[PDB]
Amino acid sequence: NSFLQDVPYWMLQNRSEYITQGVDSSHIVDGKKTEEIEKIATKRATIRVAQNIVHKLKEAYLSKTNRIKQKITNEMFIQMTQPIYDSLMNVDRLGIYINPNNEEVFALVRARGFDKDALSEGLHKMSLDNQAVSILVAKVEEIFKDSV
Amino acid sequence: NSFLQDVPYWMLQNRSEYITQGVDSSHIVDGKKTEEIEKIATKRATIRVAQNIVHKLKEAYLSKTNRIKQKITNEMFIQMTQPIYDSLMNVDRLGIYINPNNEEVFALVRARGFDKDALSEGLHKMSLDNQAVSILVAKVEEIFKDSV
Known part of the structure; x- marks a missing residue:
């Protein structure tokens, strides 16, 4: 009911987790x-x-x-x-991890890298200054460093 | 190691996202x-x-x-x-909730309300503008109100 069984560690709330990885779920409706x-x-x-x-x-x-x-x-x-x-x-x-109770399935992913050029182009599309795009990209790039 | 049994649904990483609710932990140590x-x-x-x-x-x-x-x-x-x-x-x-593997003690908590004048005194003590203090205190109330 309010208590599940055989739940993997990663499914637990962890205040200290990699920013490059995340967890989310989806419900299994009938015909699907x-x-x-x-x-x-x-x-x-x-x-x-x-x-x-x-x-x-x-x-x-x-x-x-x-x-x-x-x-x-x-x-x-x-x-x-x-x-x-x-x-x-x-x-x-x-x-x-599939929650047998409410048939909810969770996924755990982790991004290993990111396409720099792809990111810059996307940022230039939303009207961000060249200075900002440059710094923002540098920052993300650092994120994947403080992860790799 | 392995799976974890009898885990409360709240311990699940699914971003419950309730501002007034918080989850955190502490590890068991000799002498406590x-x-x-x-x-x-x-x-x-x-x-x-x-x-x-x-x-x-x-x-x-x-x-x-x-x-x-x-x-x-x-x-x-x-x-x-x-x-x-x-x-x-x-x-x-x-x-x-306590993970038996590493003896990490998790707690779920919920703030019912807050003392605004308490908040305003604290914020003023930080040298924020009167405009800032006033607006910040207002937004916290909007948060607790949205929870009630």
């Missing part, structure tokens, strides 16, 4: 292949990675050491979830 | 009874609630509809974690 459901969960998990990066970036921008002069709004940061998501490369599905 | 460790975990869980509130204020401050004129750095936001924390009242401890 298990393949599709895992596809979804895996995708949502990958979006969760993108979101973690964006958050780290807000903090960087808010930081006292920030050099980016352009005004970046919270809405704009939400917008870059997409180009960031689009630049993710080598995202490995490290695990899957 | 588990009940003492539970208290450490409970207090960290409350600090986490305060940290959730802080992250919300950053998003509101970063928002295009922000009216706060004063430049607030990430470091300053991190700093208000203390006053926010000190202003919390009626924090109910909803649960305790």
